[PDB]
């Protein structure tokens, strides 16, 4: 049953998929962990804050605000 | 219409001719056609008229 437990733990981790995963879930997952990776890495945030001419605190707050509904609301 | 991988699993005539029109338009668009795509400035005024194509330049230099 070790394989079955692995199949239950892999499902538990947030961001994993399965044969019924849609395009929307996949894309919002990669957008969300992209925003978290931007918040983590110090020189990517530097790049963005120089590009759009904003303070780094403002870019961080904008990314956190975008975290809620990236890619718009779902289908139907 | 040539036999290529694009025209596979296509069994009807009009579908084939329409997809051929589409592929023709796409490829003909994405090539580099120097005859109509080029900017020559003939020495007729030599400081004006850069809208000359590659054919009007020969007509002016003939």
């Amino acid at each position: 049953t070790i394989h079955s437990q692995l199949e239950h733990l892999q499902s538990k981790y947030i961001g994993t998929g399965h044969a019924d995963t849609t395009k929307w879930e996949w894309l919002v997952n990669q957008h969300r962990d992209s925003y978290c990776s931007y918040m983590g890495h110090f020189d990517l945030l530097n790049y963005f804050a120089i590009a759009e001419n904003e303070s780094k605190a403002r870019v961080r707050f904008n990314l956190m605000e975008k975290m809620l509904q990236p890619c718009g609301p779902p289908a139907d | 219409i040539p036999n290529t991988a694009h025209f596979a699993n296509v069994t009807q005539i009009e579908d084939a001719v329409s997809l051929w029109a589409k592929l023709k338009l796409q490829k003909a668009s994405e090539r580099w056609q120097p005859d109509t795509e080029e900017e020559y400035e003939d020495s007729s005024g030599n400081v004006v008229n850069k809208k000359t194509y590659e054919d009007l330049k020969r007509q002016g230099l003939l």
Binding site: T1, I2, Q5, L9 | -
Partner: protein, 85 residues
């Protein structure tokens, strides 16, 4: 019913018995032990204080992950104690 515990591991060190002394808990390899095993608090309590993580007999020495499991960061999951249901 050979299932890992996979709970948050604490400060308790995993133990191995005389039969399992050189073994790796995850892949059962014997080559290059690399990382000390940690177990959760419910696996280390009362009568469960010193016990083999593989079988459950009286522990005699420290349990280790192998270098192969350490490279793949398989020491970062929960408690690796084998628990039967």
């Amino acid at each position: 019913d050979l299932i890992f515990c996979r709970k948050q591991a604490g400060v308790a060190i995993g133990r191995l018995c005389e039969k399992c002394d050189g073994k790796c808990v995850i892949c059962d390899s014997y080559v290059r032990p690399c990382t000390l095993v940690r177990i959760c608090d419910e696996c280390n309590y009362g009568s469960y204080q010193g016990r083999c993580v593989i079988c459950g007999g009286p522990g005699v020495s420290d349990a280790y992950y192998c270098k192969e499991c350490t490279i793949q960061e398989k020491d970062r999951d929960g408690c690796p104690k084998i628990v039967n249901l």
